């Protein structure tokens, strides 16, 4: 054959939508085994498009198309999303009998916040009756545009087929023409091969001659033969011996090429999936600071100290959040996707703010449950997996990770979140003109000596400077008791403002005013 490009294009969709089937169905125009337990792998070839000359490194040029085939099952939406992220378009796959279910909605979900562009397919034709079949499809359709209004697929393309035409042997429908949607919907981005390598190994065998091989997607950068890369999974480094693709060998590899990795032997099993990369460059993190936006179809709150599934990349693991947002006096101020300012001060939030116009940025300190190599600026995840709704709650940025296990005492204190305490007593009795004896305010913890010398204020209106306790404590007044106040049936109580940091000042007992 002659010289070609990969593109890596997924089918997802719901528990029986037959994204299996249609994925054979697309292999054999260009058997029936049972539900999908991992990424299945095929690929047909085609034209190349005169539009993709541009990114090609005899025959007449052409383009792979390797079909990430998904699961559907719900118990097994991690993988669904670690395929997303090994993808260009989508293929959402609808029972055109019922339309989008559950994993349906999921799917797009994960869609928009991966992949660039969706075809959606609507499946099991065959089942309507002729009669009322072609009005269906256009209520169906009509219904999808809808579905995809708010989306960045608004105007995606909508196909009928039928994969495998009475139930589990006649000819699959619509697959001629579902090829050549794909060929003209198909978009490649920059493909550049500078930077990091990173590459997701999907397969883990050893060949009894010639060491192991790990057949994966490269995501990031370049690799040639005699380079070493790193396994994290197993700590060690190893050397690059052998590269196969499309059966032949081949020296140098870039982002979007799909091929298998010939090294010195290891224990496949020890890494049957995960990522593999230019050696330290891929950091481990026990938390991280992540920028978080909500997924609207998830009915619920986000609460700090909750505990959600995250996905870093493509490793899933717990983790508990703490969701904070702009300093008041910054709700307008731009989003930053790409770093994190710690010269800034931060609004703790004991639940992220959905929509007082929300502000442009929010933002979380994921604390996860165990450590976790990932990529810098790689894209963070949340859920709640442990119905009938949408699972998937937010998602985001790694911003910044931490990599040392003792984040909380080295590194915390340079992130300023406060909290914002407003506190409410009452006074009993006045000593003098200048005097208050007041109290009813706070709690066991009458450690008032931390507060000697904060501002504290009346219903009357006068600034009180807080002295020792008494029981209970007491009250300096420089202005002097108002006459409202002396004559105080009436009661005029107090109020404290403080600013409680987290971290910041935690290093410390007492509390800030400004
Ligand atoms: N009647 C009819 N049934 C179909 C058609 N296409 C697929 N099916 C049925 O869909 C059922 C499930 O689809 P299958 O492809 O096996 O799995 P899937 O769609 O990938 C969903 P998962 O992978 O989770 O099992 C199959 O048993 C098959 O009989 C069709 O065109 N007409
Ligand atoms: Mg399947």
């Avoid at 049972?34 to 792998?41: Q, S």
């Avoid at 990430?68 to 989508?90: F, N, Y």
């Avoid at 493909?191 to 990173?198: I, M």
């Amino acid at each position: 054959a002659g010289r070609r490009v990969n593109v890596n294009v997924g089918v997802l969709g719901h528990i029986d939508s037959g994204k299996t089937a249609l994925a054979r169905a697309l292999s054999t125009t260009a058997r029936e085994r049972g539900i999908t337990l991992d990424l299945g792998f095929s690929c047909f070839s085609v034209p190349l498009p005169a539009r993709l000359r541009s990114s090609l490194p005899p025959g007449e040029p052409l383009l792979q198309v390797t079909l990430v085939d998904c699961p559907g099952h719900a118990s097994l939406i991690r993988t669904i999303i670690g395929g997303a992220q090994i993808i260009d378009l989508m293929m959402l796959v609808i029972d055109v009998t019922k339309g989008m279910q559950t994993q349906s909605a999921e799917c797009l979900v994960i869609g928009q916040i991966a992949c660039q562009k969706l075809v959606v397919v609507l499946n099991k034709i065959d089942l309507l009756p002729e009669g009322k079949r072609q009005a269906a499809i256009d209520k169906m359709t009509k219904k999808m545009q809808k579905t995809l209004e708010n989306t960045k697929f608004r105007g995606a393309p909508i196909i009928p087929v039928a994969a495998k035409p009475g139930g589990p042997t006649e000819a699959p429908q619509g697959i001629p023409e579902l090829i050549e949607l794909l060929t003209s919907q198909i978009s490649i981005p920059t493909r550049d091969p500078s930077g990091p390598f990173l590459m997701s190994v999907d397969h883990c065998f050893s060949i009894k001659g010639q060491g192991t091989v790990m057949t994966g997607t490269i995501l990031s950068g370049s690799i040639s033969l005699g380079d070493s890369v790193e396994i994290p999974a197993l700590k060690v480094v190893k050397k690059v011996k052998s590269m196969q693709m499309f059966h032949m060998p081949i020296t140098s590899a870039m982002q979007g090429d799909r091929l298998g990795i010939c090294v010195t032997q290891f224990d496949p099993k020890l890494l049957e999936r995960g990522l593999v990369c230019a050696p330290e460059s891929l950091h481990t993190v026990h938390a991280a600071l992540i920028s978080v936006e909500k997924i609207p179809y998830f009915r619920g709150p986000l609460q700090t100290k909750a505990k959600f599934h995250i996905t870093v990349g493509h490793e899933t693991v717990m983790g508990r959040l703490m969701f904070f947002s702009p300093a008041p006096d910054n709700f307008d101020q731009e989003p930053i996707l790409d770093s994190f300012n710690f010269s800034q001060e931060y609004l703790f939030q004991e639940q992220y703010l959905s929509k007082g116009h929300c502000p442009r940025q929010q933002w979380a300190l994921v604390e996860f449950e165990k450590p976790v190599t990932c990529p810098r600026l790689c894209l963070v995840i949340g859920s709640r997996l442990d119905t009938n709704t949408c699972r998937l709650a937010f998602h985001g940025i790694l911003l910044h990770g931490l990599e040392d296990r003792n984040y909380a005492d080295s590194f915390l204190p340079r992130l300023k979140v406060y909290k914002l305490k407003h506190k409410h007593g009452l006074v009993e009795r006045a000593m003098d003109d200048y005097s208050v004896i007041g109290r009813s305010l706070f709690k066991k913890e009458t450690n008032i000596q931390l507060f000697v010398g904060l501002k504290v204020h009346l219903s009357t209106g006068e600034l009180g400077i807080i002295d020792s306790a008494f029981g209970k404590f007491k009250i300096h007044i420089p202005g002097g008791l108002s006459p409202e106040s002396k004559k105080i049936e009436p009661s005029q109580h107090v109020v404290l403002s403080l600013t409680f940091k987290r971290y910041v000042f935690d290093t410390h007992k007492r509390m800030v005013q400004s």
